[PDB]
Each structure stands twice: as structure tokens, then as C-alpha cells.
Write a protein that holds these residues in place. Structure first.
Motif, short mmCIF file in Angstrom:
data_model
loop_
_atom_site.label_atom_id
_atom_site.label_comp_id
_atom_site.label_asym_id
_atom_site.label_seq_id
_atom_site.Cartn_x
_atom_site.Cartn_y
_atom_site.Cartn_z
N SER A 98 0.87 -7.44 3.32
CA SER A 98 -0.07 -7.20 4.41
C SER A 98 -1.17 -6.25 3.98
CB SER A 98 0.67 -6.66 5.62
OG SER A 98 1.40 -5.49 5.29
N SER A 99 -0.97 -5.49 2.89
CA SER A 99 -2.01 -4.62 2.36
C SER A 99 -3.17 -5.39 1.76
CB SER A 99 -1.46 -3.65 1.32
OG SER A 99 -0.93 -4.34 0.18
N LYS A 101 -5.31 -6.97 3.27
CA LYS A 101 -6.49 -6.73 4.14
C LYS A 101 -7.20 -5.43 3.74
CE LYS A 101 -3.86 -6.52 7.88
NZ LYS A 101 -2.53 -6.10 7.40
N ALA A 102 -6.51 -4.57 3.02
CA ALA A 102 -7.11 -3.35 2.51
C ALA A 102 -7.36 -3.42 1.01
CB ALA A 102 -6.28 -2.12 2.89
N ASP A 105 -4.76 -1.73 -1.20
CA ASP A 105 -4.51 -0.30 -1.23
C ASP A 105 -3.31 0.06 -0.36
OD1 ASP A 105 -4.99 2.60 -1.51
OD2 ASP A 105 -6.11 2.52 0.35
N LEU A 106 -2.41 0.84 -0.94
CA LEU A 106 -1.23 1.35 -0.27
C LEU A 106 -1.38 2.81 0.10
CD1 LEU A 106 1.38 -0.34 -2.63
CD2 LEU A 106 0.79 -1.01 -0.32
C1 LIG Z 1 0.70 -1.22 3.48
C2 LIG Z 1 -0.44 -1.70 4.32
C3 LIG Z 1 -1.76 -1.40 4.01
C4 LIG Z 1 -2.77 -1.89 4.82
C5 LIG Z 1 -2.44 -2.65 5.92
C6 LIG Z 1 -1.11 -2.91 6.17
C7 LIG Z 1 -0.70 -3.73 7.37
O1 LIG Z 1 -1.60 -4.02 8.17
O2 LIG Z 1 0.49 -4.04 7.48
N1 LIG Z 1 -0.12 -2.45 5.39
#
Ligand SMILES: Cc1cccc(C(=O)O)n1
Ligand SMILES: Cc1cccc(C(=O)O)n1
Ligand SMILES: Cc1cccc(C(=O)O)n1
Ligand SMILES: Cc1cccc(C(=O)O)n1
Length: 147
Positions: A98-99, A101-102, A105-106
Motif C-alpha cells: 500500500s506504500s 501510493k507514497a 516510502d515507509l
Molecule cells: C506503509 C504505508 C505508506 C503509505 C501509505 C500506506 C497506506 O495507505 O496503507 N502505507
């Protein structure tokens, strides 16, 4: 001799020495350069049918085999290393995390928070360095240390 995890290896194709890191699975021709409480990393995850959760925002049912996931990972590494694609673009398009979308980046994290192989690779990378394929129960990762 060399930084943590690094060893000398012999190229089967060329016969020239290279360097391999058995913690990060990184490999390179250049002799690696030169631990913090926290590191910041991005990653690109490719899940497979044996992942702890074979599902992601990309695919409701992830069916690819682990070998197929590794080939995808190897291909993404190739494109990142050649400059055909950037890590962030591939993570945004293809990471099963899901990261994605970034740009993968964690954020920052300490030891004792992530899955151990991911943690160990992240802490063995220097800032700016990328891992090779890193296997966890989630899947296979490419890790980029950003801070
Ligand atoms: C680890 C992370 C980083 C950015 C978004 C998400 C999420 O929306 O689940 N998760
Ligand atoms: C061109 C390249 C690729 C990977 C690592 C390095 C280095 O650690 O100097 N350099
Ligand atoms: C965003 C999403 C969708 C389906 C499964 C998952 C997961 O279990 O990681 N995440
Ligand atoms: C990750 C990987 C790569 C090649 C073969 C296999 C397997 O036989 O399951 N797995």
C-alpha cells in the motif's frame, strides 16, 4: 575489510572481481564505500502466491509464483540500474504494498519494527544505496535507503 555484509565475488562471465552483500543481496563492481538509531527507506514489493497475504491494491488474488515474482524484481532492478526507470516510478506503478501510493516510502523506523530480513537489509544499506531482492513473508522487496 569491507562494510557489514559485503564480500568479494568472482564474475562467471567476465572473470573480474565484484562485491556482493549477503544481507542486502546487493551486487556491484565498485568496492563499497566506507549504525544509526533509525533509517528511512522506500521499497517495491512483489507479492506471490506464498505471501502471507496474496492480495494487494493491484490484484485481489495474487497468483504469480515466487519464481515469477523474483523475475519481476530482477527486471525492475535492471531498469533502475540502467536508468530506464526510476525506483519511485516503478514502486508507484508496481509495488504490491500500500506504500506504492507514497512512491514506496515507509518513513523512518528502528530495529524491532519491520520483518527481520527487511530490517537487516535496511540497516546494512548506506544512505542512497539499493538492495537486491530481499525475501520476507510478505514477498520479495527492493529496498532503497533514503535517510
Ligand atoms: C506503509 C504505508 C505508506 C503509505 C501509505 C500506506 C497506506 O495507505 O496503507 N502505507
Ligand atoms: C556505479 C555504482 C553502482 C553501485 C554502487 C556504486 C558505489 O558504491 O560506488 N557505484
Ligand atoms: C490495499 C489492499 C487490498 C487487498 C489486500 C491488501 C493486503 O492484504 O495487503 N491490501
Ligand atoms: C524464488 C525462487 C526462484 C527460483 C525458483 C524458486 C522455486 O523453486 O520455488 N523460487
Amino acid at each position: 575489510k569491507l562494510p557489514p555484509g559485503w564480500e568479494k565475488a568472482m564474475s562467471r562471465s567476465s572473470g573480474r572481481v565484484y562485491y556482493f552483500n549477503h544481507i542486502t543481496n546487493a551486487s556491484q563492481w565498485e568496492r563499497p564505500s566506507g549504525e544509526p538509531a533509525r533509517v528511512r527507506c522506500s521499497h517495491l514489493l512483489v507479492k506471490h502466491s506464498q505471501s502471507r497475504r496474496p492480495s494487494s491494491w493491484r490484484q485481489e488474488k495474487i497468483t504469480r509464483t515466487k519464481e515469477e515474482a523474483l523475475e519481476l524484481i530482477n527486471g525492475y532492478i535492471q531498469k533502475i540500474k540502467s536508468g530506464e526507470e526510476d525506483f519511485e516510478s516503478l514502486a508507484s506503478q508496481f509495488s504490491d504494498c500500500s506504500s506504492a501510493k507514497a512512491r514506496g516510502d515507509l518513513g523512518a523506523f528502528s530495529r524491532g519494527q519491520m520483518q527481520k530480513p527487511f530490517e537487516d537489509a535496511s540497516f546494512a544499506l548506506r544512505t542512497g544505496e539499493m538492495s537486491g531482492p530481499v525475501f520476507t513473508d510478505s514477498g520479495i522487496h527492493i529496498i532503497l535507503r533514503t535517510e
